[PDB]
Write an enzyme that holds these catalytic residues in place. Structure first.
Site, mmCIF file in Angstrom:
data_model
loop_
_atom_site.group_PDB
_atom_site.id
_atom_site.type_symbol
_atom_site.label_atom_id
_atom_site.label_comp_id
_atom_site.label_asym_id
_atom_site.label_seq_id
_atom_site.Cartn_x
_atom_site.Cartn_y
_atom_site.Cartn_z
ATOM 1 N N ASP A 171 0.816 -1.219 0.035
ATOM 2 C CA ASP A 171 0.136 0.024 -0.020
ATOM 3 C C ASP A 171 0.941 1.291 0.033
ATOM 4 O O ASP A 171 1.362 1.723 0.803
ATOM 5 C CB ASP A 171 -1.000 0.165 1.156
ATOM 6 C CG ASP A 171 -1.951 1.075 1.492
ATOM 7 O OD1 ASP A 171 -2.040 1.903 0.278
ATOM 8 O OD2 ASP A 171 -2.197 1.463 2.512
ATOM 9 N N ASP A 179 -2.516 5.292 -4.852
ATOM 10 C CA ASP A 179 -3.074 4.587 -3.907
ATOM 11 C C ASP A 179 -3.128 2.980 -4.267
ATOM 12 O O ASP A 179 -4.099 2.691 -4.480
ATOM 13 C CB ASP A 179 -3.999 5.160 -3.119
ATOM 14 C CG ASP A 179 -4.452 4.391 -1.625
ATOM 15 O OD1 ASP A 179 -3.530 3.701 -1.342
ATOM 16 O OD2 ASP A 179 -5.134 4.870 -1.018
HETATM 17 O O1 LIG Z 1 -8.472 1.421 4.141
HETATM 18 C C1 LIG Z 1 -7.992 1.430 2.880
HETATM 19 C C2 LIG Z 1 -8.765 0.405 2.085
HETATM 20 C C3 LIG Z 1 -8.870 -0.946 2.182
HETATM 21 O O2 LIG Z 1 -8.362 -1.560 3.133
HETATM 22 C C4 LIG Z 1 -6.830 -1.412 3.656
HETATM 23 C C5 LIG Z 1 -6.501 -1.072 4.925
HETATM 24 C C6 LIG Z 1 -5.491 -0.771 5.305
HETATM 25 C C7 LIG Z 1 -4.329 -0.963 4.355
HETATM 26 C C8 LIG Z 1 -4.821 -1.069 3.214
HETATM 27 C C9 LIG Z 1 -6.133 -1.230 2.705
HETATM 28 N N1 LIG Z 1 -9.835 -1.696 1.414
HETATM 29 C C10 LIG Z 1 -10.046 -2.881 1.660
HETATM 30 C C11 LIG Z 1 -10.465 -3.752 0.400
HETATM 31 C C12 LIG Z 1 -10.946 -5.020 0.651
HETATM 32 C C13 LIG Z 1 -11.125 -5.452 1.745
HETATM 33 C C14 LIG Z 1 -10.975 -4.666 2.958
HETATM 34 C C15 LIG Z 1 -10.469 -3.457 2.706
HETATM 35 C C16 LIG Z 1 -10.226 -0.677 0.558
HETATM 36 C C17 LIG Z 1 -11.035 -0.759 -0.502
HETATM 37 C C18 LIG Z 1 -11.511 0.433 -1.091
HETATM 38 C C19 LIG Z 1 -10.686 1.530 -0.944
HETATM 39 C C20 LIG Z 1 -9.870 1.745 0.296
HETATM 40 C C21 LIG Z 1 -9.627 0.759 0.998
HETATM 41 N N2 LIG Z 1 -7.193 2.215 2.470
HETATM 42 C C22 LIG Z 1 -6.410 3.053 3.278
HETATM 43 C C23 LIG Z 1 -5.177 2.954 3.422
HETATM 44 N N3 LIG Z 1 -4.381 3.005 2.019
HETATM 45 C C24 LIG Z 1 -5.204 2.305 0.909
HETATM 46 C C25 LIG Z 1 -6.827 2.392 0.922
#
Ligand SMILES: O=C(c1c(Oc2ccccc2)n(-c2ccccc2)c2ccccc12)N1CCNCC1
Ligand SMILES: *[C@@H]1O[C@H](CO)[C@@H](O)[C@H](O)[C@H]1NC(C)=O
EC number: 3.4.23.15
Length: 337
Positions: free
Chosen positions: A35, A223
């Site tokens: 990420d 992102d």
């Molecule tokens: O929370 C999200 C996001 C995320 O989680 C994460 C949590 C921590 C790290 C990475 C993904 N998901 C996510 C996707 C599938 C299952 C559970 C979560 C997103 C789906 C769409 C948009 C945003 C996010 N973020 C914020 C952190 N950076 C990437 C997007």
């Protein structure tokens, strides 16, 4: 340095792209999202209460089984757009695509069912800058750079459009370079607004031939951890009215027959226009007027200082192979293949 290293990724339903890392001695393997929107490494902990169903279903790090573990115990909370995780810091050896690094990471003891029960992955490997790291912990890529093994101070993302059939390859991260097999033409670079965040200036968002949004400029976070392209609630509400899309709880929908009729959406970045057709942003699951089709664009209000920003997630990266250049603080885009 001299070496290039790759991480093979799995593409789950075009929404989750994750690879495997090993933590400890012997290695405990975890499925992780890489990420660029964050800077911390975390995996669920064996210390996580089993009252969190997410900890029953995901792989847990057991420090008691690792001979290379070094205790820390500093408490930390990571607040993301979709949810929050909390736990404590630990140090151990992490293996990423053949590269081994001593890394400080979070052992998560509090993991909410929403969104974590929807995650195919166990944890997160933050690819952002130290400036965004909670507890100012050195990010993994900075530690890999310190080793002086990589040919370049860069990393690249390829996300495949094909999520179904085997033998396709879901995606790929290249540490220390790019893979010419996955892009065509030349990279077009956009300098970061500032160091500390993979964010660039966006000059406008067009729906069809007209610039409905972001006239007078706006921000774009590139992102890799986000499934969709996102904008602020007000931007998306305007974008969706132009598309004729109907708001639901967690997404916007269009009648499936209308999908192929939807206009192109263009993002103006570094003087170039980055265009997505309806095939690039609609989950075209049928052609029925009796069915609703979801869009791979949604509202996400990212708070200051990072936000308010648009976020260019997997929807964008699928079309545009992305190189994250740490040496020159820039992002390069090329047509993915
Ligand atoms: O929370 C999200 C996001 C995320 O989680 C994460 C949590 C921590 C790290 C990475 C993904 N998901 C996510 C996707 C599938 C299952 C559970 C979560 C997103 C789906 C769409 C948009 C945003 C996010 N973020 C914020 C952190 N950076 C990437 C997007
Ligand atoms: C945790 O790690 C940081 C070094 O990255 C250190 O300065 C801090 O004091 C550590 N705390 C303990 C209790 O080991």
């Amino acid at each position: 340095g001299n070496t290039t290293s790759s991480v093979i990724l799995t593409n789950y339903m075009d929404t989750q792209y994750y690879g495997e890392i090993g933590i400890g001695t012997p290695p405990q393997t975890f499925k992780v999202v890489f990420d660029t929107g964050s800077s911390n490494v975390w995996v669920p902990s064996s210390k996580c209460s089993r009252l969190y169903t997410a900890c029953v279903y995901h792989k847990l790090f057991d420090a008691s089984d690792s001979s290379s573990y070094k205790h820390n115990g500093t408490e930390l909370t990571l607040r993301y757009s979709t949810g929050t995780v909390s736990g404590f810091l630990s140090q151990d050896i992490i293996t990423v695509g053949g590269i081994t690094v001593t890394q400080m990471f979070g052992e998560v003891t509090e993991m909410p069912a929403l969104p974590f029960m929807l995650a195919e992955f166990d944890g997160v490997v933050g690819m952002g800058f130290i400036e965004q790291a909670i507890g100012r912990v050195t990010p993994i890529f900075d530690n890999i750079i310190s080793q002086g093994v990589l040919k370049e101070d860069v990393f690249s993302f390829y996300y495949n459009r094909d999520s179904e059939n085997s033998q396709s390859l879901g995606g790929q991260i290249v540490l220390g370079g790019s893979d010419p097999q996955h892009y065509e033409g030349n990279f077009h670079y956009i300098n970061l607004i500032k160091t500390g965040v993979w964010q660039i200036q966006m000059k406008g968002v067009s729906v069809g031939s007209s610039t409905l949004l972001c006239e007078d400029g706006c921000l774009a976070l590139v992102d890799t951890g986000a499934s969709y392209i996102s904008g602020s609630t007000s931007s998306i509400e305007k974008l969706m009215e132009a598309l004729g899309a109907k708001k639901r709880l967690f997404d916007y929908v269009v009648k499936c027959n209308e999908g192929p009729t939807l206009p192109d959406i263009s993002f103006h970045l570094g003087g170039k226009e980055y265009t997505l057709t309806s095939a690039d942003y609609v989950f075209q699951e049928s052609y029925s007027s009796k069915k609703l089709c979801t869009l791979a664009i949604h509202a996400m209000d990212i708070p200051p200082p990072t936000g308010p920003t648009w976020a260019l997630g997997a929807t964008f990266i699928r079309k545009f192979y992305t190189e994250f250049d740490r040496r020159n603080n820039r992002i390069g885009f090329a047509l993915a293949r």
